[PDB]
Write a protein that binds this ligand. Structure first.
Ligand SMILES: CC(C)CCC[C@@H](C)[C@H]1CC[C@H]2[C@@H]3CC=C4C[C@@H](OC(=O)CCC(=O)O)CC[C@]4(C)[C@H]3CC[C@]12C
Ligand SMILES: CC(C)CCC[C@@H](C)[C@H]1CC[C@H]2[C@@H]3CC=C4C[C@@H](O)CC[C@]4(C)[C@H]3CC[C@]12C
Ligand SMILES: CC(C)CCC[C@@H](C)[C@H]1CC[C@H]2[C@@H]3CC=C4C[C@@H](O)CC[C@]4(C)[C@H]3CC[C@]12C
Ligand SMILES: CC(C)CCC[C@@H](C)[C@H]1CC[C@H]2[C@@H]3CC=C4C[C@@H](O)CC[C@]4(C)[C@H]3CC[C@]12C
Ligand SMILES: COC(=O)[C@H]1[C@@H](OC(=O)c2ccccc2)C[C@@H]2CC[C@H]1N2C
Ligand SMILES: [Cl-]
Ligand code: NA
Length: 546
């Protein structure tokens, strides 16, 4: 049995986790959400849900991965019946790889288009521009008709052939991903030294550029404006809970995979605290750049900052490029901005594909000795299934996947994972494992958060996400009913692995229905006890313990 590889340095693991957590959305979505829900007031619920349910779940995932020394699927030897959860998260990661890499392809396309003295999104005396342009705006028109070519597609049912420019950019992104992941963590941990730190350098450059622009200080003030009376709204609290759930990186199996390569005696508690703090602070600080630029644009157009900020995939390819085109040395700033976008997306894509590859390789030993070939297969499958999003109507497929690929699926996966780790396995045994690893047993606060607060919070978020579901849309396009049905099928194909694997495991285990249950819910480490008839999970005391 080949010894499992470990991170060459700890800075490798920390930067991998930070690069995965810090992505395009986290840098450009969170501050906009904060502004839209009371600005600084939105930090009250967010932090709260970070203290009681976010940090505990991050810590749980890291500790579980580190102790069990396996990926998302192999980690579930603590409760075999729930092992499908692993596959669920893996599937989600795989699904997110079929559309997320197209964002990096768009960023690469804009980067190659930025090496010119005349940026192609400053005016609309171009072949791709409709007569209606009047400074839809030139930047939005360029994005939609010169890069995506949406005007040539009538909807998700009229995708058309893949675009060769976008296909070439996707090929470049895919090659980068493969050569970043083919050798394991020994190369990924060194690639994150560049892809996880360049975004901060470019963000500092853009922050120093923006604050000096006219009208940027007004945008910053609007960002930091505190409206506590907005906290009486349930929408603010629901948005905070949803943002905490979807901004941490839990539910994809990536934290488990990353921590599975950590030394057993590593301190996952400090790692969780540090990484969560860095991710949250990065998301908060990116708001200063976002809203300096938004306030500058608002002053230029003489409109409220709320009107400038659009919502959608092209929020980073329409508004910020438009602001950059108006700066001195606009070409250099555009190149820097799109390099930052590439480095923000590439590390997250690497983290997701690492989750997929680690989980599947750990599950099946046939792929253990061949990681290069399996990485090539996974990457080529991602590329081939990513070709639907680079078609003429590729924004519609991208929107469908972005809405349904990791929505309620992530929340359900994290909920079932928390239940399995805190109830089926027990917070007592999890705490004993953490004490064995780090030497310090989790305090009562962590145990209570894992056992009671986190499951209730995740169940509430799942329920509100299902109840307040709104079908996806792009611009004036209304997705057809069959498109919504296909999206729900995609969302449920991840989550159905839990019941499917539960049924398969229950039927596979030999014995009566009391032997099957005992061997399915009891940890594999307790096998001897289960043989004598000493199942902890069969005692009410186990379930009521904290
Ligand atoms: C969005 C902007 C304002 C950035 C601020 C966010 C982070 C800096 C916050 C979000 C969640 C917070 C954490 C939530 C929970 C805890 C556990 C807490 O520990 C305890 O409650 C005691 C238990 C024990 O010591 O065993 C120590 C602070 C810490 C790490 C918090 C540190 C600060 C964090 C990372
Ligand atoms: C395992 C699977 C479900 C994960 C997601 C893969 C993606 C890339 C797949 C799954 C279902 C696919 C869609 C199935 C139906 C159609 C209608 C057809 O007229 C054009 C292609 C289009 C719009 C496909 C686009 C790509 C698609 C969204
Ligand atoms: C011009 C400046 C801002 C660019 C540099 C910013 C980058 C390199 C900085 C910003 C935040 C930093 C991280 C913050 C704290 C830690 C925890 C420590 O235990 C290991 C290093 C690590 C993980 C840092 C690595 C470098 C880092 C990612
Ligand atoms: C539409 C595409 C992208 C979906 C890919 C799904 C993944 C999870 C599938 C595709 C091929 C599969 C492998 C095919 C061959 C074997 C050998 C056999 O002993 C079962 C396990 C194993 C190793 C499978 C594991 C799961 C696997 C890697
Ligand atoms: C698309 O989903 C994401 O963007 C997630 C994540 O991305 C992926 O999980 C992923 C998976 C496969 C391919 C590409 C990206 C990065 C950060 C952390 C959680 C969230 N994001 C804030
Ligand atoms: Cl966040
Ligand atoms: Na990232």
């Amino acid at each position: 049995a080949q010894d499992r590889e470990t991170w060459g340095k700890k800075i490798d693991f920390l930067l991998s986790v930070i690069g995965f957590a810090v992505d395009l959305a986290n840098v450009w979505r969170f501050p906009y959400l904060c502004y839209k829900n009371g600005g600084g007031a939105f930090l009250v619920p967010y932090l709260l849900f970070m203290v009681i349910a976010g940090m505990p779940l991050f810590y749980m995932e890291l500790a579980l991965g580190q102790f069990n020394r396996e990926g998302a699927a192999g980690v579930w030897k603590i409760c075999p019946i729930l092992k499908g959860v692993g596959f669920t998260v893996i599937l989600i990661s795989l699904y997110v790889g079929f559309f997320y890499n197209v964002i990096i392809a768009w960023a690469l396309h804009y980067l190659f288009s930025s090496f010119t003295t005349e940026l192609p999104w400053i005016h609309c005396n171009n072949s791709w521009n409709s007569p209606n342009c009047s400074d839809t705006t030139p930047a939005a028109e360029y994005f939609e008709r010169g890069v995506l070519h949406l005007h040539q597609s009538h909807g998700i049912d009229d995708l058309g052939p893949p675009r060769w420019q976008l296909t070439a950019c996707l090929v470049l992104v895919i090659v980068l991903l493969y050569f970043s992941l083919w050798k394991g963590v020994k190369t990924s941990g060194k690639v994150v030294w560049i892809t996880a730190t360049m975004p901060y350098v470019v963000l500092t450059a853009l922050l120093l550029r923006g604050v000096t622009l006219p009208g940027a200080i007004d945008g910053i003030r609007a960002y930091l404006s505190v409206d506590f009376y907005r906290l009486c709204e349930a929408s603010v609290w629901i948005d905070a809970a949803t943002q905490v759930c979807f901004s941490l990186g839990v539910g994809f199996g990536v934290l488990i995979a990353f921590s599975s390569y950590n030394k057993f005696t590593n301190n996952c508690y400090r790692d969780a605290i540090v990484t969560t703090s860095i991710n949250s602070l990065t998301s908060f600080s990116s708001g200063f750049v976002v809203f300096s630029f938004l306030g500058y644009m608002a002053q230029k157009h003489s409109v409220p900052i709320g009107d400038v900020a659009k919502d959608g995939p092209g929020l980073i390819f329409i508004i910020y490029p438009e602001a950059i085109a108006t700066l001195p040395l606009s070409s250099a700033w555009a190149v820097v901005f799109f390099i930052m976008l590439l480095t923000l997306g590439i590390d997250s894509a690497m983290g997701g594909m690492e989750s997929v590859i680690t989980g599947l390789i750990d599950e099946f030993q046939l792929l253990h000795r061949h990681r290069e070939l399996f990485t090539l297969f996974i990457v080529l499958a991602t590329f081939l299934l990513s070709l639907f999003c680079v078609t003429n109507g590729g924004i519609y497929v991208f929107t469908l996947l972005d809405h349904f690929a990791a929505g309620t699926s992530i929340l359900f996966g994290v909920l079932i994972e928390a239940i399995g780790v805190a109830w089926f396995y027990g917070v007592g045994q999890f705490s004993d494992d953490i004490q064995q690893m780090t030497g310090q047993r989790p305090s009562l606060y962590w145990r209570l958060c894992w056992k009671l607060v986190s499951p209730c919070f995740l169940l509430f978020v799942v329920v509100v996400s299902i109840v307040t579901f709104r079908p996806p849309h792009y611009g004036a396009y209304i997705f057809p009913d069959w498109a919504n049905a296909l999206g729900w099928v995609i969302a449920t194909s991840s989550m159905a692995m839990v019941p499917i694997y539960a049924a398969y495991k229950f039927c596979s285990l030999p014995g009566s229905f009391r032997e099957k249950l005992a061997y399915a819910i009891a940890p594999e480490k307790d096998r001897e006890l289960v043989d004598r008839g000493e199942v902890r999970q069969f005692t009410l005391r186990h379930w009521l313990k904290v």
